[PDB]
Subunit: 457 residues, 4 copies
């Protein structure tokens, strides 16, 4: 029994010496690294083609439909006079009607199909305003029924010029239309082009009632298989099957090893009773990682095959699955470096250090969250880097690492004249956070890890 456990815990070379066992699993891991990385790279081509088609079409739409638009102006693009707003709206509608004659792309119109379009209508131009909107700042008076009324004008693809905006109670103006196009660039990857429908929404937003109306354009892309396409004189499937077989064999071997470990546990524990933390010692966490990676790889490969067959179109989910599986496959080879101490410094140190690090983070996290909430709410209206909670966390994390510090300070220098109290608070907030976290918290965080290393050294 003692000899059996010893052999169970021996290294692949020692196991080969003791029983001549061929290290099949190691060769499988090397082959898996190769094939999974290749498959990820090959999938990247189709992924990139889809993403590029979407983004480039959207940029072209911005240049076609937004009057006076230039690259890099998305965040500030806005209208400031009634004349500017009317011109922008009419320019968008006119360009929609002129598209077949001016555009470099080839687009088809879409009519009807439910709200906001009536049957036969390609473009919907809608204004939304308050039901009752009497506003009299001269008398410091107003009478509002804030229920929103929508008024929509329908334009058929080849009377909207009579649009009259109710500026004083206007909530917003929207233009909705759909365009069909074909992603021909797929031919360069030896793939059949897909049929895209772009749903285009142009928003003139007046919700702030501030005299400035921002203008934006957004698109939603829907992918379909085209109807009986034809490519003249048009292997991924075999490689996908090879990946699936390699991952399945690895999964079966890992499951066999895990079952063997479970049986050896049961045996040893039963013997020890007749003569939980110690039970989780026959469990090889590396093999749990390997089976997880195999499951992820197989799921991603199935999804990739489905997308290639045009049954699915979820490029992002497939890419995440395959990328995570590739990372885990690369990481999993470290198991075979754990037997040699000279190569196991990182994992040994991590195993020793993680408990104390988690206990330390328990106390650090409340301070971090307090700072996050305070910054988000107090400074967010004034500081571009504090607009949302996740943005605040990114800014604070970068500050801890010494990044983007002066610009963070400088963003507040504009408020020194306007809001002096806010500026002073921001000084105290930033200086105290940086000092406490860089010089005290991070110091001890690193000291715990280096002390663990000194222990395992």
């Amino acid at each position: 029994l003692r000899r059996r456990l010893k052999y169970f815990f021996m290294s692949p070379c020692d196991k080969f010496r003791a029983k001549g066992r061929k290290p099949c699993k190691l060769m499988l891991q090397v082959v898996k690294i190769l094939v999974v990385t290749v498959q990820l790279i090959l999938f990247g081509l189709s992924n990139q083609l889809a993403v590029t088609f979407r983004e480039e079409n959207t940029i072209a739409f911005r240049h076609l439909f937004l009057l006076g638009y230039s690259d890099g102006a998305d965040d500030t693009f806005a209208a400031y006079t009634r004349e500017q707003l009317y011109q922008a709206i009419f320019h968008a509608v006119d360009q929609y009607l002129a598209l077949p004659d001016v555009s470099l792309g080839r687009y088809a119109y879409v009519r009807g199909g439910g709200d906001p379009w009536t049957n036969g209508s390609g473009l919907a131009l809608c204004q939304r305003y308050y039901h009752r909107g009497h506003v009299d700042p001269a008398n410091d008076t107003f009478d509002i029924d804030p229920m929103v009324v929508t008024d929509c004008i329908q334009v058929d693809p080849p009377s909207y010029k009579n649009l009259t905006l109710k500026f004083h109670k206007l909530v917003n103006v929207t233009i909705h239309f759909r365009l069909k196009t074909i992603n021909l660039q797929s031919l360069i990857n030896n793939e059949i082009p897909d049929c895209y429908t772009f749903s285009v929404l142009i928003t003139f937003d007046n919700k702030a009632h501030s005299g400035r109306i921002p203008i934006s354009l957004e698109t939603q892309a829907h992918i379909q298989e085209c109807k009986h396409p034809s490519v003249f004189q048009h292997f991924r499937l075999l490689f996908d099957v090879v990946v699936i077989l390699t991952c399945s064999l690895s999964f079966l071997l890992c499951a066999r090893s895990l079952l063997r470990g479970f049986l050896l546990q049961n045996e040893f524990v039963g013997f020890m009773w007749r003569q939980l933390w110690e039970r989780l010692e026959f469990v090889n966490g590396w093999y749990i990682l390997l089976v997880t990676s195999d499951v992820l790889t197989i799921s991603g490969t199935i999804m990739k095959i489905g997308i290639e067959a045009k049954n699915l179109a979820s490029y992002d989910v497939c890419s995440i699955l395959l990328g995570t599986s590739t990372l885990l496959v690369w990481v999993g080879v470290i198991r075979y470096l754990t037997f040699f101490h000279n190569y196991n410094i990182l994992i040994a140190t991590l195993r020793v250090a993680l408990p104390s690090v988690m206990r330390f983070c328990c106390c650090v996290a409340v301070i971090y969250l307090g700072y996050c909430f305070c910054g988000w709410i107090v400074l967010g209206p004034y500081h571009v880097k504090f607009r949302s909670l996740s943005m605040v966390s990114e800014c604070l994390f970068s500050l801890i690492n010494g990044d983007d510090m002066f610009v963070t300070f400088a963003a507040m220098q504009a408020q020194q004249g306007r809001s002096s109290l806010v500026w002073l608070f921001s000084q105290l907030y930033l200086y105290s956070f940086i000092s406490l976290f860089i010089y005290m918290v991070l110091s001890l965080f690193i000291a715990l890890i280096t002390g663990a290393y000194d222990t395992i050294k």
Copy 2:
């Protein structure tokens, strides 16, 4: 007596075991964290609405009244010819007169009400120049009486075109006017809109007499309750009361604990005399922090209620109070981690290290201040990052942390041709500061903290 002191210093779990005491204060702290964070987030909505209204109106005013203005040009926007300046002034006045017909916002005019406006006047266009201003660079001569004379033209809302600027002795030109508007976006937060008055000042500044006249626009916003408003078919107050009650109960419990500690002190010291630094051992600093946080939270909640009732308008002060109270409430929960050593590394290390750190900072601060003053005065005229003392401190602090270094060096590369001696001095200054502070000062600063940790380790 010894048993009583021991119990006084026992942990909540130990106190429960010894007397069955229910840990009411801990549950109160958890509830306070939840409710105070929620209240801060809820206040953030109104705060953001107010700040956004102000900023967006100001941006719209810049686009409406400044001829040829574009976003991002505020720091360099200026006139360079007499024709440009006249056109800018007349454009601003004409736009003020045309506002009801062109603006996307709804504004009302304000007349009279003291200087600089006469009764019935909406806009004041004033030029300020020297009383006597004979300037003759051809003969290297001048005769100046630098007393400032103001000449103001009054424009009523719907002869200023005859303005004649005295360019050679002109000090500046200002345009003052006020506009009234209503912040309707508040309806989205189920709040009654407020009435805003924007005081708008446009400055054409010639104080440098350098041939370049910068142009700027600034606004001051004053908030009022509107006169008998009406919102059709229009709980925060209950939640505020809940926060106040929770904080009041916590305050009373903390005051009771502090009184008990004071009595136990008095007893022990009296006994020790019959048989200051040691006296400050029954004082629970965590409870001082808790009572401070409770006072801040109650004050901020009262201010928030007042603002909601429209008796107050100090959003910034309220936001600072509530944000600081939220941070302190989050921090104060660390008290309950202090009993367990494995979770108390940060606080134990800080308690051991702070005295030596303060002694070290005593010596470091004089060097830091010397560098601050030298940089501010010598380099400030030439370097964008050294314009003011606070900006100099921000730049030096960021340099110590390794941030924004190359751009700091590169800002001076332009002067290498013009002012070579200044460039050389800047090289010496920056290199010496960075070397001394990053490699010597900060090293020992961190070494003190890690040595304290080694002590408490």
Copy 3:
């Protein structure tokens, strides 16, 4: 024998004391540092002249031939309407035909000389499109033969206006032409000007078929000697010969030393057998470095002479050879600091630490590569810093060093609305990578080096 080995391992001062040997090699190294650095600086003048000529001519071509081009617009310069594309093409051809009258440079035309130009033709205007290109997005249909057909129009330097683009199946449009000019600025370096031929390619790229056609201009420069030039009344060669002689003498002395060491080895090993890692102890690695540097310097000097004689034009290869040789020559002087322990801390520490560092990197590299591949494929379509594998490695390496962190986070904030799953994955990816590598991997990497120093301390 023992005395002979001792002397072999003695320092230059000790060898001088023992035998009066004059330290010729040390003086040679000092002289080499001086002369090699001077030669590199002198070569830099010609290198800079060539590079500047190429880049400035290319910038001028962009301003001359690209309609509406401005500096800094290269990455976004594009056409969006048929009218814009036609205007850009015709503007380029018209400017080519007008060049002798408008350009500030002096250019000569090149005719014929093979494809894509026919004999006598200076400019080739070619459009490439699919052989059969029926595209019908209205019916979700298409019939494509993706074989590319090229149609070229030839323009002689002083009917292209009849160009009809097949927009629906257009692959791209290219304009090719060559221009000859003379790099006169070489006169300032007392050199004979060379004759440059610039091959200019303007691309209007429609491979994405996205409605946006990017426009780019590229140049290839070919340098020739001009035919019987004449500079009125027009030493580098002697200095090059001096460098060659110094390096040759150093090489011969180092080869002599290496032979002596090899003989001493052979002797000692033969004696030890009658009475491999120990064999690599008579090998002076510093002298291997010195001979490598001498070979590189001689090769670079020969190349430099050839370029000066106008037999060669490979400035980049010569610059790399001479720069690397200069770096190695500067480094090689450290050999003489190795005898004194107080000056040998760096090399002693490196010698002790390198093996453990390499073993540690063995395990770190698989994790790094996994992250590289995952980021490149999953995030590359969405993140400007993840476009290519080398770019991904640069971004991750910079993140490990705490650089450019917040902007890396912020590039993904745009996708939070569009692609929420990708944004969440990017959050997990970046946070996990930064935490693991900055706080755990780099910590132990530094700890190995400092422990080696503690050993040799």
Copy 4:
């Protein structure tokens, strides 16, 4: 003798206890810190006024005389066609002639006064070209006499339109003129305005002969006292005298202390002989620093008085003297913290560590310089951050500190297509430099300092 030496080395408090000595020098140092800092701040006002006048006038000149100039375009502003160049030249001359009618500043013309102006001429328009310039790229031929001929046209302030540029052999075109103005803003500081003469040089540079001619404007400012000015109804001098007296008293006390120390040395050494590194122990380096600071302060104060009296105009030298003296005065107070060990950690550590640090830097410097030269010459033509040696040193120093790393990598990504070999070399260069210096050199540099601290700890 032993008692006398002991007293000589006692602290100020101990000396007061032993002899009742009043610590006059300490109070003098505090007073000096106050007064010197105040004087520096007060001088900053005049310094800022002068610098601002110069810079603002130059910006106005750029906007007035450069056709189509915009802020931020200085580095790329250039002409590309003959028509553009002619228009720019004629616009500059026309604006010079129209200045009295259009400019917002008040300027007087300057005539004659030597080259390049003839008597009575205000503006010189000069073109420089080769004496003989036959250039024939069609035949790959040229005949050049590179002697430069200058042809100058003189314009009197209120035939230059007949200018004919020799484009094929043109070296450059320059416009020279001088303008007089008065710095009136000095009145705000209660100072008499000075008379400025701006010498303005506009350069159209064709030295590259590349088809792109950069255009630049530069100014030289000369300050004079105006002739019998007059300011109606117009103390720094007393404060300057106070600073001088304080510094003189401090200097005398320090000289007395140094003489006493020298006498005590002489005595002790003579006694030790009858019964050099040890000799430099009675020398108080703090007092050498104090006397140096006093000399600098007195020199700067005298210069400041001279500038106020308008005998001098060297603002930069005065500012450097006063700023350095302020920094040294702040630093010198640390002497009184050296007696208490708890406050002397920094100085004790520095004294222990400096010798080993210097020995380490001896070896590091050759590697650093090798990298500097290699980068400057190989990468400088391709990389904006490697243009000059000082720029290269700034970039490498910033990289060592982890700053601006990704942008340094990204600047080379453009050359990956064009110059692949240079891109590969840049990869090797940057990666090797960063790894070696951040992880190995800086590690040991910090380790030496922390080990010294451990010694004095």
